[PDB]
């Protein structure tokens, strides 16, 4: 999260691009949307533009360039597909623009790897109006060819637009995306809660207590009870528990973990797993998450952004 991107599709719905096995504008719009969606999920600000009305090439380019210059960005991207029956991926940049060359090299490589096509590479030019006339740093993607069956098969493989959105986002930012399908899992909220070594959900659970189970604890503070396991002090979160009344001569309190129906497990809007906005779920609730081995789980909500929880709360 922290860069600004301005991204446009090539061509106009009324002055189209290449058309053969693939439609350039159809495919380019799908890639643009995937890349935009991914960059936004990664926390960046993204503006996009698609010309639906220009009926000539010059009007289309004037409109595209004007829009980019009206919408400053760290990088400007134009998304195209190629024609001429070569095969594979290339990225154009303004000759002599070192920042653009480096982006072009990385984006081209990443896309080619996602698609499983050859990398034709980064290519320098001073002949493209888009690159010449856009004030900021600019690259022009030629994702794959519209007139090559290898390329058509590739871009139509299951989940390829997602994979290309990832490739473009990683090429632009130099950072691996969090929402990567290999690291995705589906399961459900567990029905047990931890006795922890510290008053920190990111600590080690010394022991897990199942819904409905009874245990003996001491008061500690507003949010935590304490107990000794093997003469070591450990902690359990009070909201997981039901208690009525000290009778015990030493001030021990008998508590019970809430039933599976009433227990609620936290999912937080911060990686510290502390305060902020929390979603509270009943045991058994089905969720999908990403485990990128960061020491916590990562959950994407279209409406609410990234949330996080402890490794032991989802299985
Ligand atoms: Cl004791
Ligand atoms: Zn084009």
Coordinates of C-alpha atoms and ligand atoms in Angstrom, one line a residue:
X1 CA 0.0 0.0 0.0
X2 CA 1.5 3.3 -1.0
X3 CA 1.9 4.0 -4.7
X4 CA -0.5 5.6 -7.2
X5 CA -1.1 3.9 -10.6
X6 CA -3.0 5.2 -13.6
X7 CA -3.9 2.4 -16.0
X8 CA -5.8 2.5 -19.4
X9 CA -6.9 0.0 -21.9
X10 CA -5.8 0.3 -25.5
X11 CA -8.2 1.4 -28.2
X12 CA -11.9 2.4 -28.1
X13 CA -15.1 0.4 -28.2
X14 CA -15.9 2.4 -31.3
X15 CA -12.3 2.2 -32.8
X16 CA -11.2 -1.2 -31.8
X17 CA -7.8 -2.8 -31.8
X18 CA -6.6 -6.1 -33.2
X19 CA -9.2 -8.9 -33.8
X20 CA -8.4 -12.4 -34.8
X21 CA -8.7 -15.5 -32.6
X22 CA -8.9 -13.1 -29.6
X23 CA -10.4 -9.6 -29.4
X24 CA -7.7 -7.3 -28.2
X25 CA -10.1 -4.9 -26.4
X26 CA -12.0 -7.8 -24.7
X27 CA -8.9 -9.4 -23.4
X28 CA -7.1 -6.2 -22.5
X29 CA -10.1 -5.0 -20.4
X30 CA -10.1 -8.3 -18.4
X31 CA -6.3 -8.0 -17.7
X32 CA -6.6 -4.3 -16.8
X33 CA -9.5 -5.1 -14.3
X34 CA -7.5 -8.0 -12.8
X35 CA -4.4 -5.9 -12.4
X36 CA -6.3 -2.9 -11.0
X37 CA -8.2 -5.2 -8.5
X38 CA -5.0 -6.8 -7.4
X39 CA -3.1 -3.5 -6.9
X40 CA -6.0 -2.2 -4.9
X41 CA -6.1 -5.4 -2.7
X42 CA -2.4 -4.8 -2.2
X43 CA -3.2 -1.3 -0.8
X44 CA -2.3 1.0 -3.7
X45 CA -4.4 3.7 -5.3
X46 CA -5.4 2.9 -8.8
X47 CA -7.3 5.0 -11.4
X48 CA -8.4 3.3 -14.6
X49 CA -9.7 4.6 -18.0
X50 CA -11.4 2.9 -20.9
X51 CA -12.5 4.8 -24.0
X52 CA -16.0 3.7 -25.1
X53 CA -16.7 6.4 -27.7
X54 CA -13.8 7.7 -29.9
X55 CA -14.3 6.7 -33.5
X56 CA -10.8 7.6 -34.7
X57 CA -7.3 6.6 -33.7
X58 CA -6.2 10.2 -33.1
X59 CA -9.3 11.0 -31.0
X60 CA -8.7 7.8 -28.9
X61 CA -5.0 8.6 -28.3
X62 CA -5.7 12.3 -27.5
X63 CA -8.3 11.2 -25.0
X64 CA -6.1 8.6 -23.4
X65 CA -3.1 10.9 -23.1
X66 CA -5.1 13.8 -21.8
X67 CA -6.6 11.5 -19.1
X68 CA -3.2 10.2 -18.0
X69 CA -1.9 13.8 -17.7
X70 CA -5.0 14.8 -15.7
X71 CA -4.3 11.9 -13.3
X72 CA -0.7 11.9 -12.0
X73 CA 0.8 8.5 -11.0
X74 CA 4.0 6.8 -10.0
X75 CA 3.6 4.6 -13.1
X76 CA 1.2 4.9 -16.1
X77 CA 0.2 1.7 -17.8
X78 CA -1.5 1.0 -21.1
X79 CA -2.8 -2.5 -21.7
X80 CA -2.7 -4.0 -25.2
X81 CA -2.5 -7.3 -27.0
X82 CA -0.3 -7.8 -30.0
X83 CA -0.8 -8.9 -33.6
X84 CA 1.6 -10.2 -36.3
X85 CA 1.7 -13.9 -35.4
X86 CA 4.8 -13.8 -33.1
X87 CA 4.1 -15.5 -29.8
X88 CA 4.5 -14.3 -26.3
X89 CA 4.8 -11.2 -24.1
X90 CA 6.5 -7.9 -24.5
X91 CA 6.5 -4.5 -22.7
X92 CA 7.3 -1.2 -24.4
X93 CA 9.0 1.7 -22.6
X94 CA 10.4 5.1 -23.6
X95 CA 14.0 4.8 -24.9
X96 CA 16.4 6.0 -22.2
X97 CA 13.9 6.0 -19.4
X98 CA 15.8 3.8 -16.9
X99 CA 13.0 3.6 -14.4
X100 CA 10.6 2.4 -17.2
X101 CA 13.1 -0.1 -18.6
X102 CA 13.4 -1.8 -15.2
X103 CA 9.6 -2.0 -14.8
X104 CA 9.2 -3.3 -18.4
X105 CA 11.8 -6.0 -17.9
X106 CA 10.2 -7.3 -14.6
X107 CA 6.6 -7.1 -15.9
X108 CA 7.4 -8.8 -19.1
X109 CA 9.2 -11.7 -17.3
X110 CA 6.4 -12.1 -14.8
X111 CA 3.6 -12.1 -17.3
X112 CA 5.4 -14.6 -19.6
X113 CA 5.9 -16.9 -16.6
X114 CA 2.2 -16.7 -15.6
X115 CA 1.0 -17.4 -19.2
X116 CA 3.6 -20.0 -19.9
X117 CA 4.6 -18.2 -23.1
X118 CA 7.9 -16.9 -24.4
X119 CA 9.2 -13.6 -23.1
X120 CA 9.9 -11.3 -26.1
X121 CA 11.2 -8.8 -23.5
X122 CA 11.3 -5.1 -22.8
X123 CA 11.5 -3.0 -25.8
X124 CA 12.6 0.7 -26.1
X125 CA 11.0 3.2 -28.4
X126 CA 10.4 6.8 -29.1
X127 CA 7.8 6.1 -31.7
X128 CA 4.6 5.5 -29.5
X129 CA 2.4 8.4 -28.8
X130 CA 1.2 7.0 -25.5
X131 CA 4.8 6.8 -24.2
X132 CA 5.9 10.1 -25.8
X133 CA 3.1 12.2 -24.6
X134 CA 2.3 10.9 -21.1
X135 CA 4.3 13.1 -18.7
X136 CA 5.0 10.5 -16.0
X137 CA 6.8 7.2 -16.2
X138 CA 4.9 5.0 -18.6
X139 CA 4.9 1.4 -19.9
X140 CA 2.8 -0.3 -22.5
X141 CA 2.0 -3.9 -22.1
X142 CA 1.5 -6.2 -25.0
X143 CA 0.1 -9.1 -23.1
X144 CA 0.1 -11.8 -25.8
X145 CA -0.9 -12.1 -29.5
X146 CA -4.5 -12.2 -30.7
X147 CA -3.6 -14.2 -33.8
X148 CA -1.7 -17.1 -32.3
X149 CA -3.4 -20.3 -30.9
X150 CA -0.7 -20.9 -28.3
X151 CA -1.4 -17.5 -26.9
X152 CA -5.2 -17.9 -27.0
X153 CA -5.0 -21.3 -25.2
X154 CA -2.8 -19.7 -22.6
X155 CA -4.9 -16.6 -21.8
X156 CA -8.0 -18.8 -21.6
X157 CA -6.7 -21.2 -19.0
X158 CA -8.5 -21.3 -15.8
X159 CA -7.6 -18.4 -13.5
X160 CA -5.2 -16.9 -15.9
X161 CA -6.6 -13.4 -15.7
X162 CA -6.0 -13.6 -11.9
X163 CA -2.5 -14.8 -12.4
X164 CA -1.8 -12.0 -14.8
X165 CA -3.2 -9.4 -12.4
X166 CA -0.7 -10.8 -9.8
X167 CA 2.2 -10.7 -12.4
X168 CA 1.6 -7.1 -13.2
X169 CA 1.2 -6.1 -9.6
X170 CA 4.4 -7.9 -8.6
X171 CA 6.2 -6.5 -11.6
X172 CA 5.1 -3.0 -10.7
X173 CA 5.7 -3.1 -7.0
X174 CA 8.6 -5.6 -6.6
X175 CA 6.6 -7.3 -3.8
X176 CA 5.0 -10.7 -3.7
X177 CA 1.2 -10.4 -3.4
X178 CA -0.5 -11.8 -0.3
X179 CA -3.6 -13.3 -2.0
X180 CA -1.9 -16.1 -3.9
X181 CA -3.9 -19.1 -4.7
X182 CA -1.2 -21.7 -3.8
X183 CA -1.4 -20.4 -0.2
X184 CA -5.2 -20.3 0.0
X185 CA -7.1 -22.6 2.4
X186 CA -10.8 -23.2 3.1
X187 CA -12.1 -24.5 6.4
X188 CA -14.0 -23.3 9.4
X189 CA -13.6 -21.4 12.7
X190 CA -12.6 -23.8 15.5
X191 CA -14.5 -24.5 18.7
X192 CA -11.6 -24.2 21.1
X193 CA -9.7 -21.2 22.6
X194 CA -6.1 -20.8 23.9
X195 CA -4.5 -20.5 27.3
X196 CA -1.6 -18.3 26.2
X197 CA 1.9 -17.7 27.5
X198 CA 1.4 -13.9 27.2
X199 CA -1.6 -11.6 26.8
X200 CA -1.1 -11.8 23.1
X201 CA -2.9 -14.0 20.6
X202 CA 0.2 -14.2 18.5
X203 CA 1.9 -16.1 21.4
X204 CA 2.0 -19.8 21.8
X205 CA -1.1 -21.6 23.0
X206 CA 0.1 -23.7 26.0
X207 CA -3.2 -25.5 25.9
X208 CA -6.5 -25.3 24.0
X209 CA -9.9 -25.4 25.8
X210 CA -12.9 -26.8 24.0
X211 CA -16.3 -25.0 24.1
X212 CA -18.2 -25.9 27.3
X213 CA -15.1 -27.0 29.2
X214 CA -14.5 -26.0 32.8
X215 CA -11.3 -24.6 34.3
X216 CA -10.1 -22.7 37.3
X217 CA -8.6 -19.2 37.0
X218 CA -7.7 -16.0 38.8
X219 CA -8.8 -12.5 38.1
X220 CA -6.1 -10.4 36.4
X221 CA -7.5 -7.5 34.5
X222 CA -10.5 -6.2 32.5
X223 CA -9.8 -8.6 29.6
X224 CA -7.8 -11.5 30.9
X225 CA -7.9 -14.2 33.5
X226 CA -4.7 -15.8 34.6
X227 CA -3.8 -19.4 35.6
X228 CA -0.7 -21.5 36.3
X229 CA 0.3 -24.4 34.0
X230 CA 3.5 -26.1 35.2
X231 CA 4.2 -23.3 37.7
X232 CA 4.2 -20.8 34.7
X233 CA 1.7 -18.0 34.5
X234 CA -0.6 -18.0 31.4
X235 CA -3.7 -16.2 30.3
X236 CA -7.1 -16.7 28.9
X237 CA -9.3 -14.1 27.4
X238 CA -12.4 -13.3 29.5
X239 CA -14.9 -13.0 26.8
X240 CA -14.5 -16.7 25.9
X241 CA -15.7 -17.5 29.4
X242 CA -18.7 -17.5 31.7
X243 CA -18.2 -17.0 35.4
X244 CA -20.3 -16.6 38.6
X245 CA -18.7 -15.9 42.0
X246 CA -15.6 -16.4 44.1
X247 CA -16.2 -18.9 46.8
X248 CA -12.7 -20.5 46.7
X249 CA -10.6 -19.7 49.7
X250 CA -7.7 -18.6 47.5
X251 CA -9.8 -16.6 45.1
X252 CA -9.9 -19.1 42.3
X253 CA -12.9 -18.8 40.0
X254 CA -14.4 -21.7 38.2
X255 CA -15.2 -20.6 34.6
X256 CA -16.6 -22.4 31.6
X257 CA -15.7 -21.8 27.9
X258 CA -18.9 -20.6 26.1
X259 CA -20.9 -23.3 24.2
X260 CA -20.2 -23.8 20.5
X261 CA -23.4 -21.8 19.8
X262 CA -22.4 -18.8 22.0
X263 CA -18.6 -18.7 21.7
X264 CA -17.2 -16.1 19.3
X265 CA -13.7 -16.2 17.8
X266 CA -12.0 -12.9 16.8
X267 CA -10.8 -11.9 13.4
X268 CA -9.0 -8.5 13.5
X269 CA -8.3 -5.7 11.0
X270 CA -4.6 -5.5 12.0
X271 CA -1.7 -8.0 12.0
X272 CA -1.0 -7.3 15.7
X273 CA -4.3 -9.1 16.5
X274 CA -5.0 -6.4 19.1
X275 CA -8.0 -4.0 19.2
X276 CA -9.1 -2.2 16.1
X277 CA -12.1 -3.5 14.2
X278 CA -12.9 -7.1 15.0
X279 CA -15.2 -9.6 13.3
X280 CA -16.6 -12.2 15.8
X281 CA -17.5 -15.6 14.4
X282 CA -19.2 -18.7 15.8
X283 CA -17.5 -22.0 15.7
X284 CA -18.2 -23.9 12.4
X285 CA -18.4 -20.7 10.3
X286 CA -16.8 -21.5 6.9
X287 CA -14.1 -19.1 5.8
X288 CA -11.2 -19.1 3.4
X289 CA -7.8 -17.5 4.2
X290 CA -4.2 -17.3 3.0
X291 CA -1.3 -18.7 4.9
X292 CA 1.9 -17.1 3.8
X293 CA 3.7 -18.3 6.9
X294 CA 3.8 -14.8 8.5
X295 CA 2.8 -16.1 11.9
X296 CA -0.9 -15.3 11.4
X297 CA -3.6 -16.0 8.8
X298 CA -4.7 -13.4 6.2
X299 CA -8.4 -13.0 5.2
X300 CA -9.5 -10.8 2.3
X301 CA -12.9 -9.2 2.5
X302 CA -14.2 -7.4 -0.7
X303 CA -16.2 -5.0 1.5
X304 CA -13.8 -4.5 4.4
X305 CA -10.2 -5.1 3.3
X306 CA -7.6 -7.4 5.0
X307 CA -8.3 -9.0 8.3
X308 CA -6.1 -11.4 10.2
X309 CA -6.3 -14.1 12.9
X310 CA -4.2 -16.6 14.8
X311 CA -2.9 -19.7 13.1
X312 CA -4.8 -22.0 15.6
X313 CA -8.3 -20.4 15.1
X314 CA -9.1 -21.6 11.6
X315 CA -8.7 -25.3 10.3
Ligands
LIG1 CL1 -2.9 -22.7 41.7
LIG2 ZN1 -3.3 -2.3 -29.2

